[PDB]
């Protein structure tokens, strides 16, 4: 499983 | 009396939180004087995130590619630079709500308050400990990157953590405010794992003292152990060894309760070997390790 | 991912906290527009708190007996009156930091954020539930009276609690902001005891949904139960009876996770009868009941 | 044991 960078989406 | 996981009041930090957007990628920034600090992966598109080359991605950006919003006011970016894993966006306006502040780097075992934010807007506050394996067990969703961790001392905000990402186990990883990761992690969407975690022994003892100050005494006993005899049990139960500095830090609580540190260690040893026998301590059926000695003194005494 | 006891950001309330001193007695006040609200026992000496007649005690006071301090600035008291267990001190300066606000009374089983303060200075923030027996399990020392509890919705602070006192069992009691006590208590230093508490069933179910959303599924099972059969078990374990309204309120979490409410009730019945057999749920070895369904949705969906 | 009013001392 991979790390999730936790920026969002606009 | 009573004892609660208690965060610092968040007002001074709320007034620093902004939104930073690059393309369709958006997260939170920290606006202090005329600089906004944010995680550098705001310059990633979705396709960039598996193997970004941040130097390349940033050289293709100019100031106007960074949309910074403080509430409804858009701040004009007049300069940018990368420091480790954070971006520093110079803006044309100094934050008039900038508190007195410091950037600090904390060590595993210490605690801090997190102001979780989305789209530059504060959402909630909770208390966290930096784990021995440098992760934190937070509560963070997509959009929360750039939320900060902090402590307050005499109206000076010591910023110690900026949030970046979530590991596959569901725990969280981030940097100090100079962009240096806590722990052996990198900001890309690869398979990464923290080291094996351990329990913060000095914090467990601090919380047992809190329990005594609050009238929970059932785990006390007549025995006293040695620092070495205890550490043998500690290593057996995946607890960090107790240092002399730890014993010294526990001095005020030992003196307040009249229970010597090594007297309390014999209680901890009994609890690790036999459990709680259906009983609770300060409302918990598990041994709690996210309160430092300072946290106990701050809450059980004064303010 | 993750799930924590999470308070509302406290900045809007910090701006309203002041210190109120009468004689040698001091505590916190809430400064909104040109009124400071505070617990009325600030007008007591230690000798007065066993059997005070507050009407008499207030007649014996004048405006100048109230020293009100916002930071370093002394506020001049130009009027004083009593409303139930709260004093209202009219001051000559309206608070420029007054947020949009409401005075609302909350229901047992609901939660709120407490801004603990001493000498008019905020010290920390934490979540509390109003227990079914109208106490709260807070963290309060001498000097904390007048600290307030609140929820925030958009820009509006809904004040629901003002702290007054600690019961001998170590739990806490206070009023709404109109000075009416939560629970069968009075502001005097007498022997008092709360009724027997119960566990907030709908909140335990909400937290189990939180656990599933966060990947704890070991307590799930294929069985189901009826509302009446569940409540039979709930009554045996001192849980609040579950109502159809509670089931309705859990609807969104049920839909999101795909676990029918009465299926999750079957899991709860199992946990009540067998315990967890050395396992944990969201890091806890006990069933947590201080998260409402709204608290779960707020945090697992990122409401701002 | 009695209730404790949690005003402070000046």
Numbering used by the authors:
A (entry chain C), D (entry chain D): 205 to 214
B (entry chain A): 1 to 303
C (entry chain B): 1 to 304
The authors write:
The SARS-CoV-2 translates its genome into polyproteins that must be cleaved to release individual proteins essential for replication of the virus. Given that Mpro processes the majority of these sites, any intervention that stops this process, such as an inhibitor, would block viral growth. The crystal structures of inactive SARS-CoV-2 Mpro, with the catalytic Cys145 mutated to Ala, with 9 substrate and 6 product complexes were determined to sub-2.5 Å resolution. As in previous apo and inhibitor-bound crystal structures, Mpro crystallized as a homodimer.
We used 12-mer peptides, P6-P6’ (with the scissile bond between P1 and P1'), in our co-crystal structures. Six of the nine complexes were solved with the dimer in the asymmetric unit (in P21 or P212121), with both active sites in the homodimer occupied with the substrate, while the other three had a monomer in the asymmetric unit (in C21). In these cocrystal structures, both active sites were fully occupied with the noncleaved substrate in essentially the same conformation. We observed that the substrate peptide was extended along the Mpro active site with the scissile bond (P1 glutamine to P1’ residue) positioned between the catalytic dyad in all cocrystal structures. The N-terminal (or non-prime) side of the substrate had an antiparallel beta-strand conformation which was conserved in all structures, with the substrate residues and side chains well resolved. The binding mode of the C-terminal residues (prime side) was more varied, especially beyond P3’ position, and lacked full electron density. In addition to the fully conserved P1 glutamine, which is stabilized through multiple molecular interactions, the large hydrophobic residue at P2 was extended deep into the S2 binding pocket in all structures. The sidechain of the conserved P1 glutamine was also extensively coordinated in another hydrogen bonding network. The volume from P4 to P2’ is highly conserved between all of the substrate complexes, despite the variation in amino acid sequences; this high conservation reflects the specificity and likely evolutionarily-constrained regions of the enzyme.
